Amino acid sequence: RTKIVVKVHMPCDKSRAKAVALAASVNGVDVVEITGEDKDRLEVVGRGIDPVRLVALLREKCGLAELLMVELV
Amino acid sequence: RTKIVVKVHMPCDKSRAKAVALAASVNGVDVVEITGEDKDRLEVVGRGIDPVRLVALLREKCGLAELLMVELV
C-alpha cells in the first residue's frame, strides 16, 4: 500500500543493521531495504503504516530521521 | 516468518561456502541461500533471527557484511 523513504543517521554498518531492524518491527511494515547512493536512506513498504510514528522512532533511537517521500500504490 | 539479505565479502567459492555455513548456525535460521548476479549476497530465512548479531557475525568472520533488506513473509 504505502512506500516510505526516510533518511536515517547510520554512521557505520552496525547502525544500518539496527535501524533496518527497528523499522522492520513497526506495525504494518512488510519490508525494509537500504537505499540511496550514500546508503543513508531506508525504504519501508507496507500497508497501514503511520509514517510520523515510524520516523519519530527512528529519530529517537538513531539521532536523525527525515521523511523524504510518502508514495501510495 | 522473516527473510533477510546480507551482502558478504566472498571472493572465492571456498569463502562462499564458509559464509553460507556460518549464517546457517545463528539461532532461528531455517534456510541459507546464496544469490545475486555476482554471488555476493546471502539470503537467510527463519523465525526470530536477530539481524545485527547475524551481520556482525558475518562481518567479524568474513571481513565486511552489509544488511540490504529484511522482509516479513
UniProtKB/Swiss-Prot annotation, chains A, B:
Q: Which segments carry the region annotation HMA-like domain?
A: 4-73
Compartments, record wording:
Cytoplasm
Specify the domain of life of the species encoding this protein: Eukaryota
Instruction: Give every HMA domain span.
Output: 1-70
Q: Which residues form a coiled coil?
A: none
Q: How is expression of this protein distributed across tissues?
A: Expressed in leaves.
What the record says about family reads:
Belongs to the disease resistance NB-LRR family.
Q: What does this protein do?
A: Disease resistance (R) protein that recognizes the AVR-Pia and AVR1-CO39 effector avirulence proteins from M.oryzae. Resistance proteins guard the plant against pathogens that contain an appropriate avirulence protein via an indirect interaction with this avirulence protein. That triggers a defense system including the hypersensitive response, which restricts the pathogen growth. Contribution of RGA4 is required to recognize the effector avirulence proteins AVR-Pia and AVR1-CO39 from M.oryzae. Acts as a repressor of the RGA4-mediated cell death activation.
Q: How does it assemble?
A: Forms homodimer or heterodimer with RGA4 through its coiled coil (CC) domain. Interacts with AVR1-Pia and AVR-CO39 through its C-terminal part containing the HMA-like domain.
Relay the domain remarks: The HMA-like (RATX1) domain is responsible for the specific recognition of AVR effectors.
Q: What's the name of the protein?
A: Disease resistance protein RGA5
- Species of origin reads Oryza sativa subsp. japonica
Gene symbol here is: RGA5
Q: Which residues of the full protein are shown?
A: 997 to 1069 of 1116
